[PDB]
Structures are given as C-alpha cells and as structure tokens.
Symmetry: D2
Subunit: 116 residues, 4 copies
C-alpha cells in the first residue's frame, strides 16, 4: 500500500494501539472530502487505507485522534488531534510512511517517502 501511518507513545515506550484517524483529500471546490479511515493495530500501524490507483495526486490530510487515546489512559492532553497535511504524488507515484510520536503536551511527525 502507498500510504501507512505508524503511531508511538513516548510515555509508555510502546506502539499507540487503537488510535483512530481519518484521511481527507482536498476536492476541486476546496472542501475536504472523506478519503479513508481506520485505527492502529497492536503494532501501532494502520495499513490498507488506499491503493496505488485510488491514491491520485492531490492534497491529503490525516487527522489522528490523539485526544481520545490519552483520555482513555486517564490523561487530559494538550492537542485535540495531530494533523498531517501534504501534497502527494506530485512527481509521480510514491509510497508514504507517516510516523507520529505522542506525548501529552507534544507530538512529532515525520514522513518517509520512497520511490516504488
């Protein structure tokens, strides 16, 4: 699959399991159209969001529901969510791994982009 998200927890030193996220694609009219959604597995990964043929050029947003993750562990975190917005496939098809590292008052996000 050309899009994978991995989420880690910096407090427990573990994958962040069962984290929900929704992916949107910017439409011709400039609205955010729903594109895919899912939750992280026991390895903190979410695979199978899309296919090479469906994942056309465009601007995509991944909104990761980090607040519900922390609240289920008892913590009231700073962020409502962690958002990643990016233009994809502008130079032809690529594979994207987006990683998010979570703490109650901080997050980091990174992308590794590879040419298939």
């Amino acid at each position: 699959c050309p899009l994978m998200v991995k989420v880690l927890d910096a407090v427990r030193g573990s994958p962040a399991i069962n984290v929900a996220m929704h992916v949107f694609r910017k439409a011709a009219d400039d609205t955010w159209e729903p594109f895919a959604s899912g939750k992280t597995s026991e390895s903190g990964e979410l695979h199978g969001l899309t296919t090479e043929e469906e994942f056309v050029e465009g601007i995509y947003k991944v909104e990761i529901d980090t607040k519900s993750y922390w609240k289920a562990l008892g913590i009231s975190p700073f962020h409502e969510h962690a958002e990643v917005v990016f233009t994809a496939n502008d130079s032809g098809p690529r594979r994207y791994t987006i990683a998010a590292l979570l703490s109650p008052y901080s997050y980091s996000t990174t992308a590794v982009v590879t040419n298939p």
Copy 2:
C-alpha cells in the same frame, strides 16, 4: 499575552524568522473563525496575538505556513503547513507558549502551559 508562538529551524540551527501563521477559534457551526495572525520576529517569536479578556475558553487552531518558509530557503518540504489544535482555558486562564521545531520532512510541536 496569554498566547505566544515560537518557531525554530532544525536545518540551520536558528530561529525560524518571518514565518506567517493564522489563529482561528472554532465557531458554533463547527467552522474555523480566523481572528489573529502575524509573522515571527528575528527571535522566531510571535507575541501580541490576543488579550486575556478576548482569549476565552474555546477550541483554537494555529496554522503555521511552514511550506512558504522552506520555499523561501530553496528547500523542498513535505507538509503544507503545521497545525496546532487545542482547547484553551478549560480550567481557567492560562498562558500558553506553543513551540514548533521545523525540518523539511518533520515537525514537532510542544506546549508549555503556565499559571
């Protein structure tokens, strides 16, 4: 000022200067009402965005135009922008410092909340 934003550049080891951002508050209809903006100073800081009276409880978004910053440096970036979305003042007024550390394919953001 109960809201300050500081932006750092991890490629050059410097404050990220002249970075534009806009601040929004979530409206009753779930849309984002812009209410403040500015660009970072030579210290990488943006002060004076709001006042204690105006900065009431609500959900706020800071959208930092990281892509324009990297374009200005001739460096290809991954993200369109860096967004920070948070509920403010849920226990009473707080002073917020939001810091963002930028790289072309990564960013970090952190909040320091003081009383």
Copy 3:
C-alpha cells in the same frame, strides 16, 4: 533479536542509510566495554547486534555517528554523535527498538520496549 536501531533523515524524508554506530556495556569497574557495532541498511535499520542470551542486564550505550552521515551529504551538523544510554532487562528480558530521527541541528530518540 532483542536490540534493533532504526535511523531516519528528517531533511530528505528517507531512512538514514550506512550510518555507523557502536554499542558499549558498562563493566563492573565502571568502564564502557565494547559490545557490538554495525551500520544501518537501506531501510535505515541495524539488526543482529546481539542475542537474547548475550544481552544480559546492564547499562548500555549506543553511540550513533551522525556527524559522518551529515558530512558525507555536505553538511556540517551540530552534534558529534547521538547517544542513547539505558538500563536493559532490569525486570527480565525485553526487546528494544531504538529510533533516532536526524536533522543537522537536532535529533530525537525514542525507545519501544516490548515483553517477548
């Protein structure tokens, strides 16, 4: 293997390939004894540093030669190296993945610790 290191490059959005690192273990006399070494593969990972039986309880240091990585790309970075020092297996055997995300003037490091 119970110890794996992954290194990513935040400037290029890629694994950090051919990054050298050395692992040390603190001896009874408080010196750092060489333990293992290696370089990252094309996926930015270094596997096979040790075995469950050899990786006894102790304090371990991983020194990742990030300066030579950046210098080979033309960049004079801030850090001489990225070091990770930790006590391992204090509560019984665990598997450790240590991730390092590199920029010229910043690095982050994280550990995921799992119970085999």
Copy 4:
C-alpha cells in the same frame, strides 16, 4: 553567556525545573574534563555556565540527569541521561542555546546557534 540550556517536560507541559546537568570539555587524552554544572531554574533554564573568554574551541558534552527528574515525579524513565556532544566555536565564538524536550521514553535536543 555563550551557552544556555533549556529543558521542557512533554508530560506536564511545563519547564523541567531543578534538572541537574554537568558540562565537560574533551581533554588531550580523549577523556571528559568536567568544568561546569548547575540545575535548571523555574523557567527550565540554566544560564551562567561559562564566559566568552573561557569558552574556547573544543568538543563539549552536556550530560542532563533526566533519570533523576523522572524519578522525582514517580515516572519510570528509559534513559539514564540525555547527552549533547558538539564542537564549539569552530568558525569563531557563537552563542549556543541547547534545548531538550523530555518524555519518559523519548527526548529531543536542538541547538540554536547565533552570531
């Protein structure tokens, strides 16, 4: 002061206060000669470590006792400490601000180098 260290806590969203650290310079025999130390203030900052005259070229290490900080909060940490090792002043004297963002199983460190 050409060297300042600032430490932030990503769990509590606060400066990391009373964090101890030691600064070393690499000696001719490849050993680490300690020469300064201190603990962070209520702002998470440690100033006054050295002077412009004393802070000559060399390789310097800052060892931050992150484990003691997390132990004081009752939180199990991964790292023994956070080390920052760098060559200073290789092009002339610079002012260095080293920032460290702490979580129990992760840290980040960044340098802002100003002239």
